[PDB]
Amino acid sequence: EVQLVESGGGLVQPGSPLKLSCAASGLTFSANWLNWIRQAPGKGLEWVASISPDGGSTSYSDTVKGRFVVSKDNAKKTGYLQMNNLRSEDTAMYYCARRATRVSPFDYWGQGVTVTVSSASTKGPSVFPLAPSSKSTSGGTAALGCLVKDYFPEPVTVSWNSGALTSGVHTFPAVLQSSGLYSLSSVVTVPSSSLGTQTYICNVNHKPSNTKVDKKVEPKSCHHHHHH
């Protein structure tokens, strides 16, 4: 079955270049049109560029023409998007997508990677445990999580137990702190009976600062009839 996987992205100074890649399996870009489409708040989805199956033909939107270059490596079954002289207007999540012909739909899409064009410095997240306790227990369910504080720019990616835990996970939209930095929380509800035997680890990825954090979240003893 078909899969498109993109790589690259992060924070870049205006004027600087960045290159994205799109690796295909289950299909070859020798028989398909590779397209690039970008998404940003207030700008919905916006077609950026394409390269023909025979690779003889490239097309670009007015806004990126002359700065962006699409290419392929049929040996690698991989496509690329070289971005040059980036402007903040270029900030977006960039998707690769395939269509069999120019009148076919985009039936397969990459997962999206983010390109942020800014003069501001990147800042990696601090990751703090939100520990389960009597105070985060309700009936037979306990809540736990991670607080991801003081990062820039967006986004941060969070998984639990390397992706093996998805049920009952809630990763919230980031908030903007008065410092210009961002913060978000990710939480899970699990059986309270599971806290003594199960390990819970939040995997936090922030591409712009090249950081990957795994934080083990462990139970705390918060039950007191009398506070000393």
């Binding site: 919905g44 985060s136 705390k220």
Partner: protein
Amino acid sequence: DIQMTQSPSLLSASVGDRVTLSCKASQNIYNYLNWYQQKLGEAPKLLIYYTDRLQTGIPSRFSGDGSGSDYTLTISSLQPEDVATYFCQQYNSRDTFGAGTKLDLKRTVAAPSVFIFPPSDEQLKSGTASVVCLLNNFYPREAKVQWKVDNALQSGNSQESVTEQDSKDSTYSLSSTLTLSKADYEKHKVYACEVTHQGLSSPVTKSFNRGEC
């Protein structure tokens, strides 16, 4: 260019209803229109292509229709997992997409489960105290969280955010964090978050004493 206009921007319904989304092009596109569905954190997913052709693997309850400049997508019996944003895309001229229509559902009232988290030792060591209040799986979306320190109502030191609507139960969750410098934190004893919601007969309070864990 040919510009696509989608209506309405926000569409509200309930499980089992018939929903019709609108897409109008600035000029004739001769049936060259595709429909995609996108959920938060995911790539767009093809639903309908060439006006009315159902993509393989997509539920029969999705259907497309239209001609000239005016198109529609119809979902015949809304399901909880249909909550998402829907985009149309023309490919007559150079590709353009509509700005999208977001679909949300009304369901029965569901009361939040409320949880509180004391600051981390790690964070306190850095000079800051964040207290987090979680409201899990409730409906409707409107929910008021109030921070009280030694039973005095706080303002200006908290931020909250709410999840997208859940794909299976159509509820929402809400996270609120109160943040104080460690010096301000060590000035008070009891930290409480107090929750009001349609599903709660009277306010629910979860609290802890600083330093207790």
